[PDB]
Amino acid sequence: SSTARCSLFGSDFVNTFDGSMYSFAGYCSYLLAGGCQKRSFSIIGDFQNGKRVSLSVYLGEFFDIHLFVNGTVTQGDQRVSMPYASKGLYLETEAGYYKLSGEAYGFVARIDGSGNFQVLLSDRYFNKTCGLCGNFNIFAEDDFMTQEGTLTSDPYDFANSWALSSGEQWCERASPPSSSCNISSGEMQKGLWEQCQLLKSTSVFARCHPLVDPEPFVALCEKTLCECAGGLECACPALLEYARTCAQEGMVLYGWTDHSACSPVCPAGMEYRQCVSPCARTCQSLHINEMCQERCVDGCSCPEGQLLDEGLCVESTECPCVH
Amino acid sequence: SLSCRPPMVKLVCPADNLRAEGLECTKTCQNYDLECMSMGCVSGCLCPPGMVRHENRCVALERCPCFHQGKEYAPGETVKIGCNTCVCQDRKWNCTDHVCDATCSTIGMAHYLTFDGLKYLFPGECQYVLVQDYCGSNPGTFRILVGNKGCSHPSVKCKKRVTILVEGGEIELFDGEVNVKRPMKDETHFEVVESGRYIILLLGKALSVVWDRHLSISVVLKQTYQEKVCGLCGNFDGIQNNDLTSSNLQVEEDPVDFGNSWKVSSQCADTRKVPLDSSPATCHNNIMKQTMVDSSCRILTSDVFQDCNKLVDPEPYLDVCIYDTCSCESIGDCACFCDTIAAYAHVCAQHGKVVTWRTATLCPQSCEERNLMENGYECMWRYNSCAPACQVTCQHPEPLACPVQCVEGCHAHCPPGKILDELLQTCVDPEDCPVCEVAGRRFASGKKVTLNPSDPEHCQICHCDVVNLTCEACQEPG
Amino acid sequence: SSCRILTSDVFQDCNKLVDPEPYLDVCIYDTCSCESIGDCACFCDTIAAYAHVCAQHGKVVTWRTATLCPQSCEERNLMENGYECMWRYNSCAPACQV
Amino acid sequence: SGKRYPPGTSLSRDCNTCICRNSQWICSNEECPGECLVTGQSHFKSFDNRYFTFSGICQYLLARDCQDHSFSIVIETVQCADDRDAVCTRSVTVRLPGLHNSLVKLKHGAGVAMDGQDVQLPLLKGDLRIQHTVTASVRLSYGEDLQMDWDGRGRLLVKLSPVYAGKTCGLCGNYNGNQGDDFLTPSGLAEPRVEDFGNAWKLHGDCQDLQKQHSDPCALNPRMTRFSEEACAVLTSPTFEACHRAVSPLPYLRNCRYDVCSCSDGRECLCGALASYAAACAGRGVRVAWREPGRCELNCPKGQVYLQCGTPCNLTCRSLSYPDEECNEACLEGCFCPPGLYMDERGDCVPKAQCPCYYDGEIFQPEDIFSDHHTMCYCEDGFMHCTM
Ligand SMILES: *[C@@H]1O[C@H](CO)[C@@H](O)[C@H](O)[C@H]1NC(C)=O
Ligand SMILES: *[C@@H]1O[C@H](CO)[C@@H](O)[C@H](O)[C@H]1NC(C)=O
Ligand SMILES: *[C@@H]1O[C@H](CO)[C@@H](O)[C@H](O)[C@H]1NC(C)=O
Ligand SMILES: *[C@@H]1O[C@H](CO)[C@@H](O)[C@H](O)[C@H]1NC(C)=O
Ligand SMILES: *[C@@H]1O[C@H](CO)[C@@H](O)[C@H](O)[C@H]1NC(C)=O
Ligand SMILES: *[C@@H]1O[C@H](CO)[C@@H](O)[C@H](O)[C@H]1NC(C)=O
Ligand SMILES: [Ca+2]
Ligand SMILES: [Ca+2]
Ligand SMILES: [Ca+2]
Ligand SMILES: [Ca+2]
Ligand SMILES: [Ca+2]
């Protein structure tokens, strides 16, 4: 292992470092991860109204980046271009999806096109980082230790303990959303129960069970298949997480999106591969090899030829020059 | 339910007595002398009247410890704070009342530590009275001064000048060495010990001075005065808030106006009231650099200082570390940083806590240039962490009144039967010393002093320059 | 001024052979940017990069004193309770040895 | 203070007076009253003008008469926001062995409770008086040698006169002038580590003693690091130029940055720390006008108006009932209303036409003719006109 993983997938949902999900429709900034005795950094996430906007990394006291789906990254308040590499924080784009690496400080963040925060974190902070993605321990039941340090039964007030406010805006205790699903039940539970079920039935998902358990994943979906009207695609967010969670454990899965009738969004020219190398051989590139022994990562990428040049796929013949 | 343990009893709120000081007022050792709140007791179990609770053990007697530094001390156990012992004779330590030797300092370029203990800020550029005795209604024995030049903004600049006026003398120092301009009458008490980094400098029974050859000025007084002085360091009374008693005999609040009263040249420049802010000139609006100095100033809270962090608060010595090196543009000499921690390390040593914090990537302080003149390389010199300051030499064979226990710096060490001389950089046997023993009695190595001024008839003088077994004749008055 | 050690009395032999005007412009470029606080190494390292090149042309130099980039060597003669002190910082000794 | 004065002048500190003669101010050495203070989160002040901090969570002693036992005060601390470095005051207890050996309790509102019983203000018993001050803050007054102040949101004060010189013991120190000894545990020795001093005055053994008092909780909340700079940078801005030469601002700045980063809502934590500085600037003589629509101007209700320096003697309607009583009060700051209007019980203030009477406690309406067999009495305009 030697690593970790958190994920804030879909709408309001969370996945800690230890197999513990819940929902949270926040209202302001909240601390994702970071030390508890002493903080060399702090990954932070801003919610506008339940729905998420920005990932932020405050590197102690002096430096700040505020990336988001908007992609218009900024440093403090001055909007900078992209990519960007100050203070040991390469701010890159991998597989058409945005990345923030802090390997000196022991973390790698990223976002996808839809907006799904992810946080990879070393084994150095085992029993350290206490926050909204919980501690990096082995257990999964005890990873609600509040900013006081208090094992709580509620996955909701916990996330509200780890709030952090600014002068631009002070924020309060958000409220749980009053579910309109409770009255508009109808047929929506009888026909659409299958898309949550196919995590368990289909063979392509029928082999991570000795590594993980889909029982929470199917539990968290059935409450979100009810607000969206007329669509099977409402299941693939909770499903899409289950793919990566098994991938991180050392056991990858293949081609599952072929029949799932849901592919994650990407810009033109590319669609969702699975296990593409991060070192995408592009156009204006030096032909060097056997340095990129990095692990294999998911994300959308170009066709077989059709090399990359400035955020699009273009045929190898039309490689430009530069001056 | 639970039938509580034998040594203590279950108690019950009576319906009549509002004063049900039961379980809520759980007397432990901390709270016994203290007074406690109680609305009503609970369904708990509680030690008897003449007994208490102690870390889950109802300790029988009133012998429980007497906490200092959050640590246990059995009754009769002793501690050493300063120059005093103190023993918890019962539940309360009663300490002695031998007042200890106070100590000024000039931490960095522009700060001052008083006797009673009061860090304050004073960037000056004129010449200033560090301390004196001529204060109101007293004779005026000694008049230590200090003089700075280009030191309102700390930098590689700010060479100090120190002029000390005692016994009608004028000895002064700057640029590495000391200089006598007027020798004082009573040469007997005079003494100079160039041990290590420092210039230890006695002047009498109740006075001493130290100088790190670069900026630090740490005058040391004895029990004798006890409110006989004034100046920048204050009055030496024990009271700490009356160390801003200006020359016009009143307490101020803004120390920049304090020192302006104590300058000598009353027509030179009074310093300017700076707008206060946590960032000096360079660090102002340069938040990046501030955090590289902040972190690097947290050596004052590091694993090696953890013993001294308990005794001596580093929050004073920290604020100076961040104040100087912001202003100071350290380029070739990182001395406006390296000197502030040694000013903390020395104070840690005076409390008996040696520290070795100085490595090769961090303020190295070699000592190898001295083991150079001799073609043979005996190399007896060493940067010893904290070695004694008052040792024996060919120039000063006797044991001296020793105001400072140990000091950092480069120190000689060769095998025994060889005693140091400073002129010949190597150590040497005892007999090679220019020592003097005339008519038997043991004394110094031929001091240049005229003994016996009291009695004319008994004027039996015996000088000794280096070794001479000589005795001069006294000129008669008649 | 402090970068004019590259034109000082001790370098006068090497100033004739190796132009210091290149190595000078770096001395002023780095230490402006560099906020030397505790380690003055972004200054002390640029002159050694000039001193070494002076040595390769056969011109040893001893420019390193106690107020200026000291480079002690005393921590090594420490493990042994006896202090033989056989280690020394000196000018320029054979880079190669057995 | 960097300005000249002619000879023969007599400037007066709060403590005493001093006179210029031959370039030498002569001065008296007569004692003057001390002031222990609690405020903000956990920021203390000793009687000897020391400052420090101790974020312990238990029932601690604050002050006590220690050669005899005329009184004893007990603070109670709790965590007060999400952070661990935020420990505000909830309630303080007072105890008077000279009267019933009673037990007063100031509560987290502006309320008080004697022996469990809630009480309407005022509370004239024999010695101790308890009354509102601005109708937003309680003020105990036992004898003439003791005062207090509100413990609702935690700004406890005291006032001890020099009759208690050096004969008290607690967190607030000896009241002996000496600023250094104040870290003297009850076991009779000066401790250097504050984390040993505060936990030496706790009252319950079950309470956890702490091990480290942190100084920069802005690390655990990096978002507030910027705001804590510009916010309390006005403390040194020349708005407070008038009382840099009255009291040292550097701690009142140091205690801001520990509060604004630590507490749940930094808005009022800011504007309850600035007032901590102005209140001490005014205690020496300098008033400051530091209120703005941005810098936390309080919202006096529509009946009242904001006011800087005013007279809380001719405000309440109880004053006209007992006009003979002395009001040796200062020129205070708060919410008053114009002189033609006097304060009613129900939040509005009214002219003296419908200002009731408080005869024998009894709140009589503006026209209530009133008599037993032998007396004859009536309430005219606030005063109770009795005859016989
Ligand atoms: C999003 O990006 C656009 C284009 O740069 C910009 O105009 C807009 O203000 C940004 N909004 C946010 C939420 O930052
Ligand atoms: C984790 O840290 C806690 C708190 O310091 C400690 O009590 C516990 O033993 C640690 N556990 C492991 C597995 O290191
Ligand atoms: C301390 O108290 C003990 C016991 O009463 C007594 O014997 C001793 O003389 C006292 N020492 C001092 C320094 O007061
Ligand atoms: C040098 O320091 C060492 C280690 O503290 C000590 O053992 C030794 O006695 C010292 N020697 C001298 C000559 O001071
Ligand atoms: C000792 O003093 C005598 C004077 O009495 C002088 O002649 C002689 O040279 C001196 N000897 C030495 C070794 O200084
Ligand atoms: C310095 O090193 C040189 C070259 O090895 C040698 O010739 C010389 O003797 C050394 N000098 C000293 C003082 O060690
Ligand atoms: Ca966990
Ligand atoms: Ca004093
Ligand atoms: Ca000792
Ligand atoms: Ca050669
Ligand atoms: Ca005291």
Numbering used by the authors:
A (entry chain B): 30 to 352
B (entry chain C): 764 to 1241
C (entry chain D): 1058 to 1155
D (entry chain A): 353 to 740
Paste lines from the article.
Von Willebrand factor (VWF) assembly begins in the endoplasmic reticulum of endothelial cells and megakaryocytes where VWF is synthesized as a precursor with multiple domains. The polypeptide including the propeptide and mature VWF chain (proVWF) subsequently forms “tail-to-tail” homodimers through their C-terminal cystine knot (CK) domains. These proVWF dimers are then transported to the Golgi where they assemble into large multimers ‘head-to-head’ through interchain disulfide bonds between D3 domains of two proVWF dimers. Here we identified the disulfide linkages from the D′D3 dimer interface through chemical digestion and mass spectrometry and solved the cryo-electron microscopy (cryo-EM) structure of VWF tubules with each repeating unit containing one D′D3 dimer and one D1D2 dimer.
In order to gain further structural information of the D′D3 dimer interface, we purified D′D3 dimers complexed with D1D2 derived from the expression medium of HEK293 cells transfected with expression plasmid of D1D2D′D3-wt or D1D2D′D3-R1136M-E1143M. This yielded an electron density map covering two repeating units for D′D3-R1136M-E1143M dimer complexed with D1D2 at 3.3 Å resolution and an electron density map covering one repeating unit for D′D3-wt dimer complexed with D1D2 at 3.4 Å resolution respectively. As the overall configuration of the refined D′D3-wt complex is essentially the same as that of the D′D3-R1136M-E1143M mutant, the structure of the mutant was selected for presentation due to its slightly better resolution. The shape of the repeating unit largely resembles that of MUC2 where a D′D3 dimer is docked in the central hole of the donut-shaped D1D2 dimer8. The electron density near the center covering the D′D3 dimer is unambiguous and a clear density covering the disulfide bonds near the dimeric interface can be observed. This brings two Cys1097 residues in proximity and the subsequent formation of an intermolecular disulfide bond.
